[PDB]
Motif scaffolding. Sequence first.
Motif, PDB file in Angstrom:
ATOM      1  N   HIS A 217       0.830  -1.196   0.000  1.00 51.15           N
ATOM      2  CA  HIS A 217       0.000   0.000   0.000  1.00 51.15           C
ATOM      3  C   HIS A 217       0.868   1.252   0.000  1.00 51.15           C
ATOM      4  N   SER A 218       0.434   2.261  -0.757  1.00 49.46           N
ATOM      5  CA  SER A 218       1.215   3.482  -0.910  1.00 49.46           C
ATOM      6  C   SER A 218       1.157   4.386   0.314  1.00 49.46           C
ATOM      7  CB  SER A 218       0.739   4.258  -2.140  1.00 49.46           C
ATOM      8  N   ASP A 219       0.197   4.175   1.211  1.00 48.70           N
ATOM      9  CA  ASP A 219       0.068   5.034   2.381  1.00 48.70           C
ATOM     10  C   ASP A 219       1.243   4.824   3.327  1.00 48.70           C
ATOM     11  N   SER A 220       1.836   5.931   3.782  1.00 45.87           N
ATOM     12  CA  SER A 220       2.970   5.839   4.697  1.00 45.87           C
ATOM     13  C   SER A 220       2.560   5.213   6.023  1.00 45.87           C
ATOM     14  CB  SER A 220       3.574   7.225   4.921  1.00 45.87           C
ATOM     15  N   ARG A 221       1.400   5.610   6.555  1.00 47.06           N
ATOM     16  CA  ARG A 221       0.914   5.010   7.793  1.00 47.06           C
ATOM     17  C   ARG A 221       0.631   3.526   7.608  1.00 47.06           C
ATOM     18  N   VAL A 222       0.040   3.155   6.471  1.00 49.38           N
ATOM     19  CA  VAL A 222      -0.209   1.745   6.189  1.00 49.38           C
ATOM     20  C   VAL A 222       1.106   0.987   6.075  1.00 49.38           C
ATOM     21  N   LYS A 223       2.111   1.601   5.444  1.00 47.77           N
ATOM     22  CA  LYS A 223       3.416   0.957   5.331  1.00 47.77           C
ATOM     23  C   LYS A 223       4.045   0.740   6.701  1.00 47.77           C
ATOM     24  N   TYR A 224       3.955   1.741   7.580  1.00 44.02           N
ATOM     25  CA  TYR A 224       4.499   1.593   8.925  1.00 44.02           C
ATOM     26  C   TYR A 224       3.760   0.512   9.702  1.00 44.02           C
ATOM     27  N   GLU A 225       2.433   0.460   9.567  1.00 44.04           N
ATOM     28  CA  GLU A 225       1.662  -0.578  10.243  1.00 44.04           C
ATOM     29  C   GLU A 225       2.038  -1.964   9.732  1.00 44.04           C
ATOM     30  N   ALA A 226       2.232  -2.097   8.418  1.00 41.95           N
ATOM     31  CA  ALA A 226       2.643  -3.378   7.855  1.00 41.95           C
ATOM     32  C   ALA A 226       4.027  -3.777   8.345  1.00 41.95           C
ATOM     33  CB  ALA A 226       2.610  -3.315   6.329  1.00 41.95           C
ATOM     34  N   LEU A 227       4.949  -2.814   8.427  1.00 49.11           N
ATOM     35  CA  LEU A 227       6.279  -3.110   8.948  1.00 49.11           C
ATOM     36  C   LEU A 227       6.210  -3.555  10.403  1.00 49.11           C
ATOM     37  N   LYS A 228       5.376  -2.890  11.205  1.00 45.91           N
ATOM     38  CA  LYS A 228       5.212  -3.289  12.599  1.00 45.91           C
ATOM     39  C   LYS A 228       4.622  -4.690  12.707  1.00 45.91           C
ATOM     40  N   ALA A 229       3.634  -5.003  11.865  1.00 42.03           N
ATOM     41  CA  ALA A 229       3.047  -6.338  11.876  1.00 42.03           C
ATOM     42  C   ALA A 229       4.074  -7.394  11.485  1.00 42.03           C
ATOM     43  CB  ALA A 229       1.841  -6.389  10.940  1.00 42.03           C
ATOM     44  N   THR A 230       4.885  -7.106  10.465  1.00 45.46           N
ATOM     45  CA  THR A 230       5.924  -8.046  10.058  1.00 45.46           C
ATOM     46  C   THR A 230       6.948  -8.248  11.166  1.00 45.46           C
ATOM     47  N   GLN A 231       7.335  -7.166  11.846  1.00 48.85           N
ATOM     48  CA  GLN A 231       8.265  -7.289  12.963  1.00 48.85           C
ATOM     49  C   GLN A 231       7.665  -8.121  14.089  1.00 48.85           C
ATOM     50  N   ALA A 232       6.380  -7.916  14.381  1.00 47.42           N
ATOM     51  CA  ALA A 232       5.710  -8.727  15.389  1.00 47.42           C
ATOM     52  C   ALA A 232       5.555 -10.176  14.951  1.00 47.42           C
ATOM     53  CB  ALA A 232       4.340  -8.132  15.717  1.00 47.42           C
ATOM     54  N   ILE A 233       5.587 -10.445  13.646  1.00 43.02           N
ATOM     55  CA  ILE A 233       5.425 -11.814  13.165  1.00 43.02           C
ATOM     56  C   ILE A 233       6.697 -12.618  13.406  1.00 43.02           C
ATOM     57  N   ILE A 234       7.803 -12.202  12.792  1.00 43.35           N
ATOM     58  CA  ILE A 234       9.057 -12.940  12.903  1.00 43.35           C
ATOM     59  C   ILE A 234      10.215 -11.996  13.201  1.00 43.35           C
ATOM     60  N   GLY A 235       9.992 -10.697  13.025  1.00 40.91           N
ATOM     61  CA  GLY A 235      11.047  -9.717  13.164  1.00 40.91           C
ATOM     62  C   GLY A 235      11.346  -9.382  14.614  1.00 40.91           C
TER      63      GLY A 235
END
Lengths: 236, 53
Positions: A217-235
């Motif tokens: 997603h092009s939204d910066s907030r959406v990108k940050y949320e996705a990065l946080k979710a990925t970090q919570a997954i395995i990161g």
Amino acid sequence: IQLQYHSLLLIWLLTFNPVFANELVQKYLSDFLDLLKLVKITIKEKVSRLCISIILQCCSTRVKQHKKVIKQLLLLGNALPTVQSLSERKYSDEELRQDISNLKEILENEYQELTSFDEYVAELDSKLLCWSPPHVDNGFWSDNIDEFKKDNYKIFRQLIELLQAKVRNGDVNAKQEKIIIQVALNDITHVVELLPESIDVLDKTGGKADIMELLNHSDSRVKYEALKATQAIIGY
Amino acid sequence: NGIATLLQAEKEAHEIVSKARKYRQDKLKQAKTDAAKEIDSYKIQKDKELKEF
């Protein structure tokens, strides 16, 4: 203004009967919420008094499931803060003031038994979110974490379905849609970090795949949320 | 660009984890089958000894 006053008078007359008011409230819940909002939005004393009377007639105990209807209104439509603001406000009609006081008392009685978990459940049922304080305060997300996994993680499944629907509808990239997606992502990340037993359920339901795909997603907030979710997954 | 590589790596990591889980499940079945064959010989030997007596 005259047309609005006539419509309000007709609504009050229709809601004078208890069965008619009960039938109208269920079929026009969105209309009832809009009228409640317009009561504070409108500045005319007569229109505000008519709207308050119409709301009270729907919330009157003579209507079927009056307590349930009042609770549903106060939950979905955020009627309690509006009634509190109206009580603090001033009106030129004594009848309007009495109606506002009665509505505030009813809203306070309804919210006496309310809970943060109930508010979160209502928001999830409404399929809408605007970064509510239950989604921000760690107290609610900690106390209700156990309840989220209850009923075969019914709350987690509903959140995953909402996230999938938002991903399907995320092509619009609307500001409200983006905010809802960000709130859903934050809620999913919280419910995954706390009680991680739902990670397997989310992976089976495809929620993890949807979260990973949402990183495009092009939204910066959406990108940050996705990065946080990925970090919570395995990161980390 | 980099996000796609991470997503592909996660799928590869899941496959590696799945393969590792499959190996453990296969090893337990293989160990059980190997143990069963050894146990079968002892029972057969005992049965022959019991029959002889």
